[PDB]
Amino acid sequence: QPVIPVRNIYYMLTYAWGYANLEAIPGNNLLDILGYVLNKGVLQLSRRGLELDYNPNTEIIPGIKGRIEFAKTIRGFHLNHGKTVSTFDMLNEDTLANRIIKSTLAILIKHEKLNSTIRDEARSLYRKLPGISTLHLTPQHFSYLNGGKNTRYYKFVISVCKFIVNNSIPGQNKGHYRFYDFERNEKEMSLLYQKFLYEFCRRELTSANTTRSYLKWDASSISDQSLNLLPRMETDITIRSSEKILIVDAKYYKSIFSREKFHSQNLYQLMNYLWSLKPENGENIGGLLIYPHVDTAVKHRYKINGFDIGLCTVNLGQEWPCIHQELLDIFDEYLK
Amino acid sequence: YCLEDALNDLFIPETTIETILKRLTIKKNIILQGPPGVGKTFVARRLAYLLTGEKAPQRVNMVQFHQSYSYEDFIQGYRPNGVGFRRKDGIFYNFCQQAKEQPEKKYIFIIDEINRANLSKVFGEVMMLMEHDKRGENWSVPLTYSENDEERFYVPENVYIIGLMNTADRSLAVVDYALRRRFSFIDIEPGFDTPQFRNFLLNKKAEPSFVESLCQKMNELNQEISKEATILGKGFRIGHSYFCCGLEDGTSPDTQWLNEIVMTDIAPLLEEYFFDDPYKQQKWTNKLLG
Amino acid sequence: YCLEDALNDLFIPETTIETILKRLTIKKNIILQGPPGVGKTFVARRLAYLLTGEKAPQRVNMVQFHQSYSYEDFIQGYRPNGVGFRRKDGIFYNFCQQAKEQPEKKYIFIIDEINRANLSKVFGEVMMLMEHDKRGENWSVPLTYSENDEERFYVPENVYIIGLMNTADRSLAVVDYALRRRFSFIDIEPGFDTPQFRNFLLNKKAEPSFVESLCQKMNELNQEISKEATILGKGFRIGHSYFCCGLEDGTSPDTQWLNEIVMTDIAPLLEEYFFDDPYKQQKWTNKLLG
Amino acid sequence: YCLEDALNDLFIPETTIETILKRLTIKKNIILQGPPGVGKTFVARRLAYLLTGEKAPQRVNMVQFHQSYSYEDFIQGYRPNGVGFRRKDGIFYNFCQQAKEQPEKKYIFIIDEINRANLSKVFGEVMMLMEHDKRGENWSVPLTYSENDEERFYVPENVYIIGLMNTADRSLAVVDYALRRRFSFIDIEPGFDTPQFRNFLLNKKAEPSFVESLCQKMNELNQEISKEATILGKGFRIGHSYFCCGLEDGTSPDTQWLNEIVMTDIAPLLEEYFFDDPYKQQKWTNKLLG
Amino acid sequence: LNDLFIPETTIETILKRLTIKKNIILQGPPGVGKTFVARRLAYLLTGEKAPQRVNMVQFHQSYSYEDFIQGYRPNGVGFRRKDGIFYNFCQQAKEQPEKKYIFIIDEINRANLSKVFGEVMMLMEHDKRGENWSVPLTYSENDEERFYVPENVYIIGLMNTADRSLAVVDYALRRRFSFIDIEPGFDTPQFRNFLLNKKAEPSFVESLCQKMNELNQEISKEATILGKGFRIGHSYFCCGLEDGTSPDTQWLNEIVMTDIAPLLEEYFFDDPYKQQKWTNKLLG
Amino acid sequence: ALNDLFIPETTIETILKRLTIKKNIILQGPPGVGKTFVARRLAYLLTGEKAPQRVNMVQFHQSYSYEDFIQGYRPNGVGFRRKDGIFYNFCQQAKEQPEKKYIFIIDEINRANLSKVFGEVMMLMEHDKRGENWSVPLTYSENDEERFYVPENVYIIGLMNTADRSLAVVDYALRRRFSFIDIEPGFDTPQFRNFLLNKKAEPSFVESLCQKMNELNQEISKEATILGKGFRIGHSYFCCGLEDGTSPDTQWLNEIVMTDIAPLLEEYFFDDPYKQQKWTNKLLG
Ligand SMILES: Nc1nc2c(ncn2[C@@H]2O[C@H](COP(=O)(O)OP(=O)(O)NP(=O)(O)O)[C@@H](O)[C@H]2O)c(=O)[nH]1
Ligand SMILES: Nc1nc2c(ncn2[C@@H]2O[C@H](COP(=O)(O)OP(=O)(O)NP(=O)(O)O)[C@@H](O)[C@H]2O)c(=O)[nH]1
Ligand SMILES: Nc1nc2c(ncn2[C@@H]2O[C@H](COP(=O)(O)OP(=O)(O)NP(=O)(O)O)[C@@H](O)[C@H]2O)c(=O)[nH]1
Ligand SMILES: Nc1nc2c(ncn2[C@@H]2O[C@H](COP(=O)(O)OP(=O)(O)O)[C@@H](O)[C@H]2O)c(=O)[nH]1
Ligand SMILES: Nc1nc2c(ncn2[C@@H]2O[C@H](COP(=O)(O)OP(=O)(O)O)[C@@H](O)[C@H]2O)c(=O)[nH]1
Ligand SMILES: [Mg+2]
Ligand SMILES: [Mg+2]
Ligand SMILES: [Mg+2]
């Protein structure tokens, strides 16, 4: 049951969310890394200052604050017992975003398997936020925050918070929590990898233009113009440049990690994308299959059906910069 | 009040309208729960005349709730005079009083956008009487602002209450506790894949296959809405009334008229829905244009 | 009054302006969403003269919503007299009384920064009534603070409503989708591409090369903005209002004038816009100077 | 008043001041942003007398915003006179009325610590009116508490508004981009490396070497801070004010004096700026002392 | 200058800093005599033991601008504008310009200082004191009537360094306030002399200082979590021995369980052994 | 009363040493410790005269405010008048008798916000700052003629409970001004066993029952996070049902197991019926 070293995994999330030294922490397992990110990450926000959103408050007070609501005032007859119904703007850190952080920290502490230092430091931080109210978190709360009025920095940790909550399982005890075995399932690993490249290519490949492209079948049907029964076909990524276009399909498989038979089932999808796609520029058409491997990286090229296609792998577990170097070396060959 | 005038134009299957009439005689407190654009406001005005069987406005009353709506206006409350304070019978209190004179005749009270105001803050004490079983003079109660306990108010059995609630906001995942017990929820479909909606377009000189093409897109797209639960549930999906409106001139349906709707209503609505993935907006917008 | 007078200087395509009238006259409530500086306030006063066909302000009313407007202010509320309160009909109720004085001539009520306030709280009962279908005496409804003597408030057909929701503040965006169906949303672009924009500068002693140089850069920036969606969406893209003003004295446009604009207004805006790396700021700022 | 009266004691260059007065005559609204301690409050009262040209405090109003500042106090709202409530025209409303009497003479309204208070709530109706091209009766607007639509409020053309906003706190920033367009943002720097700041020190019996040594220290120190924009932008860097005041007695600014002031003020201030690195705190402290 | 357990340098520093800058914040852990320092110090600056000039208040999260400066509050008949204390206090000092009036601010860290002070957050600085810098307040009906701090006013704020709040940091207020730390002062002879002037044993005193200092250094050991700001003050020892009960290990051990143990619990939370160790360390 | 109290004598004597000096105190413990009865007997103990008049009691809640506690304006038939609260009335009553110690009981103190209620006075109640020197004008005291100061004799007791895990860390305001004491359930105490042996209880039935609960209280406190030392059950239920005229017996115990401990045990765990069923059945025999 061999898997990727965990420290490298965190980098892939960075590109996945589109936005530090990990050598310092001695805990190989993921939650030690991610918990340290949040626990240290919170400190950066607090130094500059946490988000303060004016929440209006309509309450019954012994005096005038802001705007009096005449209707509620007389109806409750609060004038006689020296009270008014007035609307005013308390400035708090009680926003939905900040509550998530504090509620999240409870889960992080409650996790049964964790570094002692990480749990200790956060509990002070949990104590350091008295005004904010704890919450019982659901994805719908994170869903509400897609507006992103908050800064770019806030969205980073919240994206992490989204990862932790979904990847948290109750363990031995009713109260405490246990971390998900993220590594073992390919599907979430796969969706990460596809998302990892798509946002990554925008960053580094400034030379080329990169977009996900929807394609429509060349078919015509007497029955239906819809062709609803036909499969929806949406590229993982297309990375177009003036001299050559290139479509890529990448996935994480466990069998391919083994150095025997080879899993290239996704290739069946790839060719069909090439065929229905017709280039107006007509510069060239190229294809790529890239998969994760652990030990070493091997690159091949093919001339299959009049198309120039490459199958390649990357030596995950090597080093993050050389891996970053490795992709730029890779794409340059085929992007030509 | 003939049914053919009432129900033929309607898009809803006859199954649901009949079911609505069943529970309404039985329970008398009913909620139609669906997204905007399915005629929730539209049906309720007709149904009131159906049950009474005649077109009489006095026996039927309509209101829309909002945060400012309160007990003091709804039921009973004090409005200041030039200086002094005079008690005033509210709408719902005054409304039932008419129903008392003519007990046989059915009386209807229609409440739009009910979720916005807390039921307790407005109805309050009367939520006890409002219940279907505990109606009639046996359960009479004296009001909060009554000068003496002798004066009493009982919800006559004849009144039936209709409330229109929309599953268009995320907050309504925490439904108010008061609604669930006392009202009977009914789900209203969007009603694209319906015979009468189709025939309405055909009556307005529309190509049938293009209409069927349209419905598959709405039926397909609405399915995408329903699958999600975190951001967009089934209750958020599009209603059928963008297309109903705007043809009073006789202007024929076409891609141009469709595009007028798409750019001006459904495209920016989708921008709010699918914010995180702009391309997901692109995916559907091009799909509809075709 | 006619289109010819209004569109003399306006930078918007004619297409939207008539397309606006297409949706409005059938639907009667709209919102124009664009970033600040695209003439949203500017056109709205002009449109009033087209539909009425004459330049009269009396049939027009203009207001702004500041997150403290309330139903008590908009429609019906209680105001202090010397010692005691009285009921005061708000501006909109006052507005409809004038408008229903004559149905023939159209009346416009204009709301700037409509997105801010919690509109459900302000409109209340009107949220149903504004819609084109449910207008006139048929759909008259009694208000919250209405007198016990039955008197009901109905939106006349002649009323047309225009809203101006800026696209900068994402949080302050319509997420009450039930209300978003009442309105028809018309996107307005920055307005750079049009020659009608270009003529305004050239008529004011400007070189077309310098003009075409400038416009090329802006779209690249807005394209650079349009690419991102995480923080800076499509809507954030820069308006043309900055360039409109300051040239009345006769100062012809030149890079000195542009340099003042870039350093003084846009350059602070950019660092707030990006606020991740200064390198991104320096490149695009220098591009404009180049 | 005259220009040279201000520049004698002012450390800021005149070139920036010319840029300041240039925009303000055009845009009519400005915001000066910098770290605390560079004379934003200092210039603002001086600058008003420059623009008017005469030292009239009657025509100048100066206020400091804060969280519990609202539209009702600022603009208009109902407040208690005594037994009876009244509408109290706020300070800004009254300021414009005074300016209306004297259209020729410029009137100035100065807001310190603008970024704190919720400006969107405070200005409200003003947010549209204040723009330089929209001032005057033509764009007249009714207020919330206005008795009728006929009662309308227009900003005079003469009015100039100046806002002071520190760049130290990212929580409190003018993120409302629509509001950002109205104001022309002028960054201000500490201006250590200026003759006027040095001449003031040498005028106060200071060593030319020590003064020039100091200027290199702070200039280099600020450059380190501005580099790490992720944590601390240029807006956070130290001002000149700590060094300005406190020398009124006549004490010459020796190194002993410098060593005292850094110990009490700058040293703990640096600790928060560099919480994690004690060495980096110790490094820069020792750099000034050595 | 006799019973003070802080070195003379700090108090000498304070008066020069205070008289010049006119605003200061005295920050330290509880039990270092911040109140006694400020109250004594205020009497020095006036030169007479006059408390009517001196006013002290204790901030808390719910305190508001309504109370401090101005505000609308009800009389028996109805509502009126009610002058808060500081408006009331500065008017009092304005009555007598020559003498020095003092305002003491306890528990400052808790409240959002910007929110409370508001308008005076600019006015308080020593240069911007006078009619020229006057402003009309928010609730002032007319612009002409204004509020200005007089030059005579001096302000002192006492701040606990042991309850850090990662909510709001204002470095602009820090420009107004000149910050002064205060150490507990176990090392000082003056605290020891008091104990020796209460018939304490000489070794017991020397043993006592070593005991607290070893713990105090541990508190400042981990700068990340805690610091010198947390470390224990001496004031617990001052009270309770003026009856005539001279110091003894029994009395100290009572304080260990009585007072120090919750502090230890509070600080070294979820760490029984370290509390058990350090608690038992003092007893030995 | 001393022997009648079930808690250790050392705890009883120790408190008065604290209270006399500190003048402010808070007892945090499980429900059913006789916290109300404790303070009253202790309050009578400090005065020594068994006067209920000296002592006054109040129960806090979230709505309780400065107007209820201290002073506020209350409606007349027409208009409104300033209405003295409990504490303002309480202290002025004690002002007449300086020598006489007067006690104040604030129940469920942790629920309410101390700041919101007290306001200005929150510093004046701390023992260091007391008396006429520290006089302050009150919020509604328009005139400066009279100021509110609590005299030295006043002692303040706060009744708080460690029962609920929902409760987070105590407010910072409290910690400064109050001395925190935890009271044990007191099963092991001889005074509680002599409160059962005086009622003709079997020593085996007595000793077994004390051993029975002690094992329960130990296990509930075994949990590190959710159930702490404070959770463990108190003894006051055992008083209830014996001195009215009905003798102790296992069947009488059996009713109490169903009465309070069985629902109480459900509340603490609130997850496992088997673990509850284990203990609930185990208690019976
Ligand atoms: N002719 C016809 N029109 C229908 C039908 N169903 C809905 N509509 C039309 O849809 C428009 C709006 O209906 P409405 O009841 O107001 O929807 P709603 O649920 O009240 N909207 P909201 O939820 O936003 O308040 C009206 O023109 C209505 O007549 C129908 O079956 N037949
Ligand atoms: N002459 C001329 N000026 C234009 C044109 N379009 C915009 N402007 C100018 O740009 C400035 C602001 O326009 P405005 O309508 O207020 O934009 P807005 O969207 O309403 N502003 P906001 O979004 O902040 O509320 C005015 O000077 C306006 O006249 C145009 O087509 N012609
Ligand atoms: N004498 C003199 N003092 C100056 C000069 N520039 C700034 N100062 C002084 O620095 C202090 C603060 O001025 P101020 O405008 O309030 O700085 P600020 O940036 O506004 N601070 P903040 O933003 O925090 O309010 C005053 O002592 C002011 O007089 C100057 O050129 N000459
Ligand atoms: N003699 C003497 N008493 C002190 C000294 N410091 C504090 N005290 C006394 O300790 C008691 C409590 O002081 P307090 O202000 O509550 O502590 P703090 O607020 O945390 O600094 C008072 O009697 C103080 O006067 C000191 O240095 N010398
Ligand atoms: N006689 C006597 N009764 C006690 C003793 N301890 C507690 N009680 C009784 O237990 C009851 C009060 O318990 P308490 O915990 O305060 O109730 P709670 O406030 O609801 O938790 C009363 O019947 C008290 O008299 C005691 O030591 N002696
Ligand atoms: Mg409706
Ligand atoms: Mg505008
Ligand atoms: Mg300043």
Author numbering:
A (entry chain M): 3 to 21, 28 to 267, 272 to 348
B (entry chain A), C (entry chain B), D (entry chain C): 168 to 457
E (entry chain D): 174 to 457
F (entry chain E): 173 to 457
Q: What text appears in the publication on this structure?
A:
McrBC is an antiphage defense system of Escherichia coli that specifically cleaves invading DNA that are methylated. Furthermore, upon binding of the endonuclease McrC, a higher oligomeric form—tetradecamers of 12 McrB and 2 McrC protomers—is formed. GTP hydrolysis by McrBC bound to a recognition sequence powers DNA translocation, and convergence of two such complexes on the DNA results in nucleolytic cleavage. Here we present the structure of the AAA+ domain of McrB in complex with McrC at 3.6 Å resolution using cryo-electron microscopy (cryo-EM), which reveals the coupling between the endonuclease and the motor and the mechanism of activation of the GTPase.
The complex was formed in the presence of the GTP analog 5’-guanylyl imidodiphosphate (GNP). Three-dimensional (3D) classification resulted in nine major classes with varying tilt angle, indicative of conformational plasticity. The two protomers of McrC in the McrBΔNC complex are related to each other by a two-fold symmetry. The dimeric interface mainly constitutes helix H9 and has a total buried surface area of ~3000 Å2. The catalytic residues, Asp244, Asp257, and Lys259, are located close to the dimeric interface and aligned along the FA interface of McrB. A particularly interesting feature of McrBΔNC is that the McrC stalk blocks the pore of the McrB ring.
